[PDB]
């Protein structure tokens, strides 16, 4: 009836057997013991993990409604207003409304066309700042730091038609720290006792007070420094000139309330910025460690675009090797490796097993994308696979082995923004630098740090960026 799994113990369930760190690696090991679908009890919380494309199809597509909700806990409830946001809402009319209101301002080809030259410039500014850093060509630079500013500027250009001038900008650093604390508080293991053993919830008072205050400070910065300016600019310009203008217009029309507006901002800041950065950083690391692939990419852009001609968004469709490098980075180095948790509001069935209502459903998407029984040597960083035996497999999940952006109703709408940003950024870097390891090393250390939320390079990479002219 229930899926197989390790026998639990009273009130702790499997918590003390498996620990707090549930990631795509040790969930693979459990799948090796218990099969394509297995159950864990984290105290009172049911967790179901599926590890086949067939089961991903069931969770994401065939029963996409039945399993189309999100799990929450007392911490995420504070930050999302108990699902008054977009990401962490259950499936229903609220989610439909939010998803619809966000489509025109954020997630169309027109949004891409209106923002691509900003993305292209922010990428060029990364190159210029690294190009002038004396360390970059010598011991190397931790390039994700400058790329972080690029991601902030790309996303705040879309949201508010604004950017941050430098890594030293006070507002940029204030916002960065609030976003970091927002995610640290929601991803910390230290509140698990009160979620898994709910009778202990009173002892979380202090932790939850900390979450309240963080939300207060973070929403205040969103409001004071970005949202209120748009109301002012909207009134004086009389028009709708950025994504969040559309959102505020929906509030003015009475379709949403101001809390919904701020939760959209809250969502984009945790869903879009560091997430894209992880893939860019991973791709840089693998390009350093695969010089032949790096040179082949550089040759593609020179051949297709011409020498010295910068890559732009409309060029990506005629740079299939660049696109394949991006897909292979999302495959081998999938940085959101368990997607986002799904949840069934009502009792359901998967693979014939009964799934209790409100179970947390995890798709091990990294494993789907790296299963040696379903891919040709997935351990290799081989972008050519997406030009050869995988040449029809795309990032939007037409093949249920490769679902880095999900599939179906709860799939990532930001795919339309992430893919061009990654491609432009990697292309621009390779057009201007030889990407090399630091002098004392032959390779970038690509050891994973797998967690329930992200699969980041464990050590932020120090990259030597040697100008091609040097
Ligand atoms: C490489 C970068 C990114 C990756 C790999 C990624 C991946 C994902 C995944 C796996 C999900 C959940 C799929 C599921 O629940 O089955 C998701 C959801 C979401 N993503 Fe992204 N994403 C990226 C960038 C972005 C960006 C740039 C934005 C917005 C500008 C964004 C906005 C969202 C939103 C709003 C959701 C929630 C969708 C819903 O629950 O209805 N993402 N993303």
18 phi and psi angles, rounded to 5 deg: -105, -25
Q: Are 331 and 370 in contact (CB under 8 A)?
A: yes
Alpha-carbon Rg for the chain, nearest whole angstrom, is 22
Query: Residue 394's Cα: distance from chain center in Å?
Result: 17
CA–CA separation, 270 vs 340, rounded Å? 12
Residue 345 to residue 3: CA distance in whole angstroms = 18
Main-chain phi, psi angles of 467, to 5 degrees: -55, 140
Q: Are 415 and 111 within 8 A, CB to CB?
A: no
Give all strands of the β-sheet with 360-363 in edge-to-edge order. 37-42, 45-50, 360-363, 342-343
Residues in contact with 387: Cβ distance below 8 Å, sequence separation at least 6, in sequence order: 320, 321, 324
What is the distance between the alpha carbons of residues 352 and 348, in angstroms, rounded to a whole number?
Answer: 9
Question: What pairs with residue 37 in β-bridges?
Answer: 50
Among protein residues, the one whose CA lies closest to atom 1 of ligand 1: 276
Distances (CA, A) of 302 to 306, 312, 323: 5, 13, 15
What gap in Å lies between CA 17 and CA 9, rounded to an integer?
A: 9
CB 260 within 8 A of CB 98: yes
| CA–CA separation, 185 and 181 (whole Å) | 6
The rounded Å distance from CA 404 to ligand 1 centre is: 9
Mutate to test the pocket of ligand 1, among 94, 414, 420, 453 (most ligand atoms within 8 A of CB): 414
- Residue 340, sorted as left (phi over 0), alpha (psi -120 to 50) or beta, turns out to be beta
CA separation for the pair 403, 172 (Å, rounded): 32
Which pair of tokens denotes residue 413? 């709408």
Question: In sequence order, which residues have a C-beta less than 8 Å from that of residue 104 and are 6 or more positions away?
Answer: 110, 111, 246
Experimental method: X-ray
The verdict on whether residue 187 carries a ligand-binding annotation is yes
Which residue among 268, 271, 276 is best mutated to probe the pocket of ligand 1, counting the most ligand atoms within 8 A of its Cβ? 271
**Residue 45, marked binder:** no
Is the distance from CB of 34 to CB of 56 less than 8 angstroms? no
Q: Which tokens belong to 378?
A: 């997935």
Q: Which residues does residue 360 pair with via DSSP β-bridges, in sequence order?
A: 47, 343
Other CB atoms closer than 10 Å to residue 166's CB: what's the count? 11
> Which of these, 164, 250, 178, lies nearest to 217 by C-alpha position?
178
Is residue 185 part of an annotated ligand binding site? yes
Task: Report resolution (Å) to 1 decimal.
Answer: 1.7
Contact, 262 vs 227, CB < 8 A?
yes
Computed from CA positions of residues 437, 441, 446, 451, in that sequence, does the dihedral angle turn out positive or negative?
negative
Q: Decide whether any atom of ligand 1 lies within 6 Å of the 57 Cβ.
A: no
Q: How would you classify the pairing of strands 433-436 and 462-467?
A: antiparallel
Contacts with 209 (C-beta within 8 Å, 6 or more apart), sequence order:
none
| N-terminal to C-terminal alpha carbon distance within the chain | 66
- Cα gap 135→42, rounded to integer Å: 47
Check if 425 has its Cβ closer than 6 Å to any atom of ligand 1.
Answer: no
**Buried b / exposed e along 41-79 (16+ C-beta atoms within 10 A):** bbbebbbbbbbbbebbbbbbbebbebbbbbbbbbbbebb
**CA separation for the pair 60, 28 (Å, rounded):** 20
Is 279 labeled as ligand-binding? no
Cα→Cα distances 451→12, 187, 205, 366, Å: 21, 9, 26, 12
Q: What tokens were used for 273?
A: 């910025």
The distance between the two most distant Cα atoms of the chain, rounded to a whole number of Å, is 67
Contacts (Cβ under 8 Å, ≥6 apart) of 117: 312
Alpha-carbon distance of 356 to 359, in angstroms, equals 6
- Nearest CA to 418 out of 326, 343, 346 is that of 326
* Domains of the chain by residue range: 1-470
Residues present in the chain in total: 470
Rounded-to-integer distance, Cα 231 and Cα 253, Å: 14
**Integer Cα distance of 327 and 402 in angstroms:** 9
User: Is there a binding annotation on residue 183?
Assistant: yes
For residues 53 and 401, is the Cβ–Cβ distance under 8 A?
A: yes
Asked whether the beta carbons of 349 and 469 are under 8 A apart, the reply is: no
Q: Is 218 exposed, middle or buried (0-12, 13-18, 19+ CB in 10 A)?
A: buried
Q: Are the beta carbons of 213 and 182 closer than 8 angstroms?
A: no
Q: Are 449 and 337 in contact (CB under 8 A)?
A: no
Ligand 1: which atom is nearest the Cα of residue 363? 16
Rounded Cα–Cα distance for residues 279 and 333 (Å) = 7
Of the candidates 411, 417, 390, 416, the residue with the CA atom closest to the CA atom of residue 328? 390
Residue 269 CB–ligand 1 contact under 6 Å? no
- SS3 labels along the chain: CCCCCCCCECCCECHHHHCCCCCHHHHHHHHHHHCCEEEEEECCEEEEEECCHHHHHHHHHHCCCCCCECCCCHHHHHHHCCCCCCCCCCCCHHHHHHHHHHHHHHCCHHHHHHHHHHHHHHHHHHHHHHHHCHHHHCCCEECHHHHHHHHHHHHHHHHHCCCCCCCCCHHHHHHHHHHHHHHHHHHCHHHHHHHHCHHHHHHHHHHHHHHHHHHHHHHHHHHHHHHHHHHHHHHHHCCCCCHHHHHHHHHHCCCCCHHHHHHHHHHHHHHCHHHHHHHHHHHHHHHHHCHHHHHHHHHHHHHHHCCCCCCCHHHHHHCHHHHHHHHHHHHHCCCCCCCCCEECCCCEEECCEEECCCCEEEECHHHHHHCCCCCCCCCCCCHHHHHCCCCCCCCCCCCCCCCCCCCCCCCCCCHHHHHHHHHHHHHHHHHHEEEECCCCCCCCCCCEEECCCCEEECCCCEEEEEECCC
Phi then psi for 25, rounded to 5 degrees?
-80, -50
Q: Is the CB of 370 under 6 A from ligand 1?
A: no
Helix axes 109-132, 93-106, angle to 10 degrees: 60
Place of tokens 């494993």: 367
382 dihedral zone (left: phi>0; alpha: psi -120 to 50; beta): beta
CB of 67 closer than 8 Å to CB of 80: no
95-108 b/e (C-beta count within 10 Å ≥ 16 → b): bebbeebbeebbbe
- Residues 6+ away with beta carbon under 8 Å from 398: 392
């Amino acid at each position: 009836r229930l899926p197989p799994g390790p026998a639990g113990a009273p009130v702790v369930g499997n918590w003390l057997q498996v620990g707090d760190d549930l990631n795509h690696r040790n969930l693979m090991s459990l799948a090796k013991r218990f099969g394509d679908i297995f159950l864990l009890r984290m105290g009172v919380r049911n967790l179901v993990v599926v590890s086949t494309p067939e089961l991903a199809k069931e969770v994401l597509h065939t029963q996409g409604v039945e399993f189309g909700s999100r799990t929450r806990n007392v911490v995420f409830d504070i930050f999302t207003g108990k699902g008054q946001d977009m990401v962490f809402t259950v499936y229903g009319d609220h989610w439909r409304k939010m998803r619809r209101i966000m489509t025109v301002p954020f997630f169309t080809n027109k949004v891409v066309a209106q923002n691509r030259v900003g993305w292209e410039e922010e990428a060029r500014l990364v190159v210029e700042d690294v190009r002038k850093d004396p360390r970059a060509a010598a011991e190397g630079v931790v390039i994700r730091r400058r790329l972080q500013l690029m991601m902030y500027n790309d996303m705040f250009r879309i949201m508010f038609d604004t950017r941050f001038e430098s890594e030293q900008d006070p507002l940029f650093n204030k916002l960065k720290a609030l976003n970091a604390e927002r995610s640290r508080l929601s991803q910390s293991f230290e509140y698990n006792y009160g979620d898994f053993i709910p009778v202990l919830r009173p002892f979380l008072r202090g932790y939850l007070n900390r979450c309240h205050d963080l939300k207060t400070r973070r929403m205040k910065v969103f409001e004071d420094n970005f949202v209120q300016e748009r109301k002012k600019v909207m009134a004086q310009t009389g028009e709708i000139r950025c994504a969040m203008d559309h959102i505020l217009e929906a509030e003015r029309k009475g379709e949403i309330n101001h809390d919904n507006v701020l939760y959209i901002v809250e969502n984009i800041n945790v869903a879009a910025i560091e997430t894209t950065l992880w893939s860019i950083e991973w791709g840089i690391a693998e390009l350093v460690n695969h010089p032949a692939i790096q040179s082949k990419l550089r040759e593609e852009m020179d051949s297709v675009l011409g020498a010295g001609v910068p890559v732009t968004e409309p060029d990506l469709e005629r740079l299939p090797y660049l696109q394949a490098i991006v897909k292979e980075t999302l495959r081998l180095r999938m940085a959101i490796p368990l997607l986002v948790p799904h949840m069934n509001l009502n009792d359901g069935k998967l693979a014939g097993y009964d799934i209790p209502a409100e179970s947390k459903i995890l798709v091990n998407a990294w494993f789907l994308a790296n299963d040696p029984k379903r891919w040709v040597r997935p351990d290799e960083f081989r972008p050519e696979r997406f030009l050869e035996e995988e040449k029809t497999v795309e990032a939007h999940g037409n093949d249920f082995r490769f679902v880095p952006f999900g599939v179906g109703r709860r799939s990532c709408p930001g795919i339309i923004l992430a893919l061009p940003i990654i491609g432009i950024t990697l292309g621009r870097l390779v057009q201007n630098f030889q990407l090399l390891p630091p002098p004392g090393q032959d390779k970038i250390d690509t050891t994973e740090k797998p967690g329930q939320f992200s699969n980041q390079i464990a050590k932020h990479a120090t990259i030597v960026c040697k100008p091609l002219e040097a």
